[PDB]
Amino acid sequence: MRVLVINSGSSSIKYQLIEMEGEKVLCKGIAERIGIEGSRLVHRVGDEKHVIERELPDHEEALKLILNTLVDEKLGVIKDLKEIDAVGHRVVHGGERFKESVLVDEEVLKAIEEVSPLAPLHNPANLMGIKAAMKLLPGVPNVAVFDTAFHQTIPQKAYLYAIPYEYYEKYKIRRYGFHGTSHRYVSKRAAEILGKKLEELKIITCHIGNGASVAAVKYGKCVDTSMGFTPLEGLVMGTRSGDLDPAIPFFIMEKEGISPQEMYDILNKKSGVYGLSKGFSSDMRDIEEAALKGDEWCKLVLEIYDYRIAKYIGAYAAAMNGVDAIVFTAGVGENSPITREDVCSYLEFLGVKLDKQKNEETIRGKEGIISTPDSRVKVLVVPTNEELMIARDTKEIVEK
Template sequence: MKILVINSGSSSLKYQVLDMKTEECLVKGIVERIGEDQSDIKHKNKEKICENDKKIKDHEEALKEVMKLLIDPEYGCLKELSEIDAIGHRVVHGGEKFFSSVLINDEVIEAIEENSDLAPLHNPPNLTGIRAAKKLLPGVPQVAVFDTSFHHTMEPKAYMYGLAYELYEKYKIRKYGFHGTSHRYVSQKAAEILGKDIESLKIISAHLGNGASLAAVDKGKVIDTSMGFTPLEGLIMGTRSGDIDPSIPLFLLRKGYTIDEVDDILNKKSGLTGLSGISNDMRDIKKAIREGNKKAKLAYDVYVYRLAKYIGSYATILKRFDVLIFTAGVGENNPEIRKDVCDYLDIFELKLDEEKNNILNKEDRIISTSDSHVKVLVIKTDEELMIAKDTKKIVEKMGKN
């Protein structure tokens, strides 16, 4: 079975084709700046890379370009598009309607649309990708895989806010959590690497990219996660503030800032960018620290401190923890951050093997010592493979029925 995985953003379309016999990625790519005067296409198969620029007006046109590349004799992986057996879509917000991945039909599309109020920057472009694929590959089954669904095992005590209950009833204001596909993948992978049944493990997973979140996973089920009603809650991130006093936006509004300006500050001008005044990229922050920049050092210290504090609180609600996972761009590629976070966690008898931690490779691996009470792992996240696995499972079940 060959599955096309699509992750459609507001002005981008990321894609992969996976052969599910081997779970191998055959091609991957991204179309960026859709709708602008000049769009960028970056496409890679096992042997060659193709990059070109052209004007692409919308996601349907972007997907047409992708399909041309998929069957291109030099850069593609298919002889014809009929080899695509199914399409898996990343959808950010499933609200309270979707507790797992689902086969897409008209009712599902309508429900995703209804949840667009909860994710106005994400669900509409996700739907655009679904509609484009439906038009260009009619009859090919499509599956929606939701960022929020893995977190639906949280109990009300974890997902409810201290607000009037009527706000939950009226507007479904509650914690949902995000990055669920990544947390699910690395939790399962950790159990596999350790040779343990996931049912026996208490895991804290740290997805650290430009966006960042933690998940506390007990017996394979999430009991809490750091992102909330939106992806703004929780950890310090590249440009997002994470947790703040909720009165701060009100204070800024009373000082004359507009709603859009406050939204922009919290989501795009805070976090590492806001504290350092330099960049949202941890590589830039570390370079500035080496050059003696005090604001960069402050941004780094706040980032690490908040992360360690959250891990400690999750260890409390788990009542112990067996596994700590670092994943995503920052988590996978920054031994200094891993060490500095783990230095805060001595109370849990967590011992990092510094030699293993400092190895700069892309392999999934254990980086704690053999006598560490908590096993620490670095795992490369693979959300596309998780989406493809869910898609395969649902399509096979559909065939049996």
């Protein structure tokens, strides 16, 4: 069966065409700079990278160009458009309604719009992708997979903020969490690698990239996650501040004559790794490189970054009353043996020991266990594949 996996953000649509049976990526790419000048499609078919220049005023005309070139028999991969058996969409916010992936009909579509104000910068462009896909591929089923859904199992004690309850009643302000379908993917994948059922494992998953969150996955259900009502909460991120003292923003606004918009922006665009390094970079490996070159200041940014991750592992261990395994994934989790090592140094009191050899080996996309045989808590690097996860939910639903 052939699933087309779509992820439409405000400026772009990026796609993979997966063959379920072989679970093989037939091709992938990105339609970039939609709405802006010099929009284009970057299309990869194995080794080859093809660049197509063209005006793409919106997501529909963009998805058209994608579909056309899936079939164009020079840069193509399938004979017909009938070859696409189903389409799977990443939708950022599902709210409290959507507990798991769903087949999209009018009902679902209306229900997604209703949730859209809870992620105004993301959901609109997801829907744009869905509506465009249903239009250009009539009859082909679409499945929505929600970034927030994996986290819907989180108990009340964990998703209510210590703020007037009216704010939840009235605006549904709670912890929703994000990177759901990634935490779900790697937690499940880790259990398979350990040769054990997911329902008898307490796993802490660390999705650490340009954006980062941790998830506490107790017996297969998520019990807590680092991100909150929005993606600002929790770990240090590329440009996001993570956790801070509720009072700071108010102080900064007042001492500097800054509207809440101007401050929210600063917390969101100019903070985190970028903020800490005085505007050096937001890319964590730019700092890793500079720290290894002897730059004193980066060694600190690195330590700050790692420290907070370590504390979250500790915190969530407490939340589940145990850890059986810890999983690193995403851009940094998969590629920084140093970060993995620093974070784990805080954790030997739990019985965590790394195998230096294995740690340095599992880099650039490889996957495996990094804890020593004797280590009481298992540590794994499981490169995330959120797209495949979508394709798999689409596959299951569509078979019916």
